[PDB]
Amino acid sequence: VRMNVLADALKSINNAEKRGKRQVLIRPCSKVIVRFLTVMMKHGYIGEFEIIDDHRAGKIVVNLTGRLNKCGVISPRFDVQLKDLEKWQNNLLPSRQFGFIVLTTSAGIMDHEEARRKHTGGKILGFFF
Amino acid sequence: TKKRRNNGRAKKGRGHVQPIRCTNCARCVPKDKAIKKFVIRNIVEAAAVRDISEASVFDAYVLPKLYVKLHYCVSCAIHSKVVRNRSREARKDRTPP
Amino acid sequence: GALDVLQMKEEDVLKFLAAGTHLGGTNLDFQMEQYIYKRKSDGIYIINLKRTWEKLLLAARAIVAIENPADVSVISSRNTGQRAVLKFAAATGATPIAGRFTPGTFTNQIQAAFREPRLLVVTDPRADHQPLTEASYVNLPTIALCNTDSPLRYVDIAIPCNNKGAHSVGLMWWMLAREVLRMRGTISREHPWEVMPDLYFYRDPEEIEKEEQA
Amino acid sequence: GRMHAPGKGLSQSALPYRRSVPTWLKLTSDDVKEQIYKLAKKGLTPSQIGVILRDSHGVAQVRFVTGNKILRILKSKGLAPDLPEDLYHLIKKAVAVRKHLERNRKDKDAKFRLILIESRIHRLARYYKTKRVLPPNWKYESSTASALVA
Amino acid sequence: PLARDLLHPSLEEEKKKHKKKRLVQSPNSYFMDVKCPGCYKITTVFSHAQTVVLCVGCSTVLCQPTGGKARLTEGCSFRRKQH
Amino acid sequence: MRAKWRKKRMRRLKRKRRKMRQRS
Amino acid sequence: GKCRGLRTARKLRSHRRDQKWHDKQYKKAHLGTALKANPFGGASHAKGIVLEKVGVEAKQPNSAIRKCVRV
Amino acid sequence: MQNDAGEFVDLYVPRKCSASNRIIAAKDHASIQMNVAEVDRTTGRFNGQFKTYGICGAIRRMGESDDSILRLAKADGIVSKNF
Amino acid sequence: EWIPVTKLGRLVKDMKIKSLEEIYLFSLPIKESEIIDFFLGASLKDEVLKIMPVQKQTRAGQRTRFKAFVAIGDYNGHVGLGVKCSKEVATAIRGAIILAKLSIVPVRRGYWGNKIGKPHTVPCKVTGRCGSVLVRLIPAPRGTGIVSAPVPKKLLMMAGIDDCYTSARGCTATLGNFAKATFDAISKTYSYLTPDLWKETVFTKSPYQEFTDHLVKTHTRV
RNA sequence: GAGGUUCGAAGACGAUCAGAUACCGUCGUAGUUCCGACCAUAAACGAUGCCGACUGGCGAUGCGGCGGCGUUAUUCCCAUGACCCGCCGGGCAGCUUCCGGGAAACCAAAGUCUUUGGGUUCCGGGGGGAGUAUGGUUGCAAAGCUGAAACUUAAAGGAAUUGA
RNA sequence: UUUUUUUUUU
Ligand SMILES: [Zn+2]
Incomplete structure (x- = not known):
């Protein structure tokens, strides 16, 4: 009934910030999601977060600074390579000054700038700016 | 577009309503959608009551009342002059006074 | 106000209890629940008196912040608050408006009634919807004597109170007046203010005539 | 939702976070298995074997108390x-x-x-x-x- | 209210909410020991009971499931164990 | 052409068409 | 809503081809019926024989008698 | 805001709300900048110091300004901790 | 030869306000065109877009009123648009320029790719809505120019943006919705929360409190 | 195939007009009733797909479960009923509302939609020709399901503005 | 109790 769990997490986070609140309550929790939030840590688009261990897929509480405009998902995990990764940037990112496209590189979950430095692509997962 | 949110009748929940004949033209219309009013009319006209009263044997104990159910569909509700057309904010009203 | 010189006293508790500022009404607002302790058996939600003092002090800080008393306004539609509105206008220099608030006072710059206050205090958002809506176009900070059901639309700060009560309205206006005068140094904090709070109370014309005749 | 019904029901078992056996339970794993056996010989489905073991006797979770599931204990023996x-x-x-x-x-x-x-x-x-x-x-x-x- | 304590919701609000949707999902039911008049044996009955609980020594029923909590008999006293 | 009685006329033109093909 | 899965490309090409039979430009050209129906038969010009000289009335707003030739 | 040469190249720097942390529109005519005056601990009289509170028009227009100020002042120490 | 009638207008006449940038900061409504005329009157140009003779049909008939669009911009950093419907062609044109100047809004500019040189494009690709028209401004490399309809092309140059690409979804034939939708997008650029705006804003004294004694002196005189 | 009580296609008779093949009235077959097999259509309209996450509130109704000051009947106790105050989950729902979106009318979904991707089915591609021709299939028939092309047109449309 | 039509672009 729930095909994607990162797509829901990124949508509910976006729905919270648009209202203007301070925290979010994510019913599910996947290690894919937390590896997405660690990129959010380093780029400074949300604050710290905690994982409630309820023995059932976990729960996430996330604190927000209201610094994020939109965070989205590409539910089909498209096989992005180094040739077309630049194309996704000009198709998805609001500008080259900021914003990040995150993708599951074989080296781990990394942002697109780290992917170019590692010379490794992967499957696209989502974006934020 | 929808002139009326109600779509004229009061039936929003159920699928069907049994029809009732119109009084002025004898046309079948759903009950909930028709203009239905209770009419109480004295048997005798207020001006004419006195002529009967004077000839009345009773020690002022008889006052018969005629009560008749009234049902008009909408095509001739207007002709009767009842339900005169309302203003754009006018429609959203109720009983009237 | 967390300072000890500004802490709670006893004579204020008596005034709040007597005027009936702490009963409010039955209708509870979702954004006003944090100012309610609990409810009675009649649905009357008792307003926490610590919160009334804190929002009175925070409001008072906003008033003393302005340096030109002539650049603050006071508006009253209900006649119950008109007398207190007028007294507060004369005591601290606020500009008084009464009766019907003519449209275009804040937005229309042409007519002679055009006012551009830097601060306005509002007895009740419900009765003063028109000045608050007109306040939305001149970014005019406002202080609202909020009720348990007062619509906090275009409000900036709220003081819990009972706007329905005639005595509750007048007491609070005198109390904000006493605080701001204590804070600004014109009236000393070491002695009680010499004017009775009843100068802010609006009395019905029939009761006024009876008292004058007697 | 439901498979063949338009019911958005929400009622299942909210098992507690504490997996440990309660201290007050003065029962042994052998006695739990023996009470399981008594219900098994009677000819009862494990759905109400667990229910009877919960309402009376005093077992909260058979799996928590012993370490194996009710069908697994019965299937290892062979009478299921x-x-x-x-x-x-x-x-x-x-x-x-x-x-x-x-x-x-x-x-x-x-x-x-x-x-x-x-x-x-x-x-x-x-x-x-x-x-x-x-x-x-x-x-x-x-x-x-x-x-x-x- | 823009900010409400999701990490530490109040105990009053947590007990007020459903057994689901909580910080950690927990039963609203409990265990409680039975003492029936005329009998010495102590039974264990779990809240929200659905089967007949008959005392062996007393030879009398203790609680009849009538929907929700098992409505016990008149004389028997209840003592909720383990909080 | 009212919607319904255009449909009636098309049906009656169809029924005439079928009888012509049947006799031929 | 429209399918997005990564292993539905055949469905995408089929849904686009079976919905391409729904626009007056594509279906007109790729059925082979329009070319068989125009008198030109796909011809930008044609050599014909002038048969009759006729005068045709203009449309409703214009009262004119155009000079057409039946060829 | 800054080019690669290090120069500060921009027209201006608009303020922000202290609660929503969102840019206040230059033509947002419902956004306030409320000043809260401060007093000495013992004297209780105005000392010429004030604390600013920027509120965007939308947050006030929705109804969260009253809660935002209370949280901010309490954090700043103005509002008593035992609120 | 102008008399102020409001607080902000008086501050402009007595040179207590440096420019309009401080005004944008405090989101104070502007209600005089003399503020803009004094500041950038020597570098502001205006261009009328369309005058469609709208009318009405009553028991008397058709009487046409003229509508006037005009954008006012210094071609450097400040543009705004205004509309005016009246009975005469010139009256509509003149007043619409007053309103367009009155509603001028800052145009925030940025860099594309390399940050060297002067700003020429938008900080990021941005959207604005008016009716069904969705105008999307897309950052462009240096030296490309404006890619848009002729009227928004004039509006973007009037705003001062050198290079732009534009994509529009909706009935762009409606000029008013077209210009208003791109202006909403342009007004969304400086309202857009970019990382370089994450730095905490140091609150500055409002012009009212910074200049209060002068305000009282002038108001008592008037 | 059972009986036609009441209504009531077709039809008849009586009024109204220049015509009335109709409205009105009186009958009235088939039908309206039950049973078996067909027929599969409607404005089968919420003119508004299903599954799943997030996404304000206020006064109410149904069910079930939980707590209680009190009123009231079984009574003499609990208990069982019933009213009032709430809480929790599943609902049919208003009403206000600058959440929001929409062309607007209007709608917490008709929202989270260019700052465009939760899964997917059916289904539309300017207006006519045309739900037509032909083929196939179902039906006792009437007709239903599937379903073109040639040719022709610059508008047909939706909402809203003021008059009449 | 009824009262049909009215003309071609401009
Ligand atoms: Zn009728």
């Missing part, structure tokens, strides 16, 4: 019925529907429900075929359903 209990009762309910069906052929509400319940077996039996619970050649038919139940 071959047909899974959930698969069994659906056939019984469909049997009950068909008894009323041949009594009254005009009930088209019963015919629709029977078709619904039939496919409830069919999807379940396909999964059991993949997981080797029942032989792959096992099939469910209206004629042999009466033999399957009881």
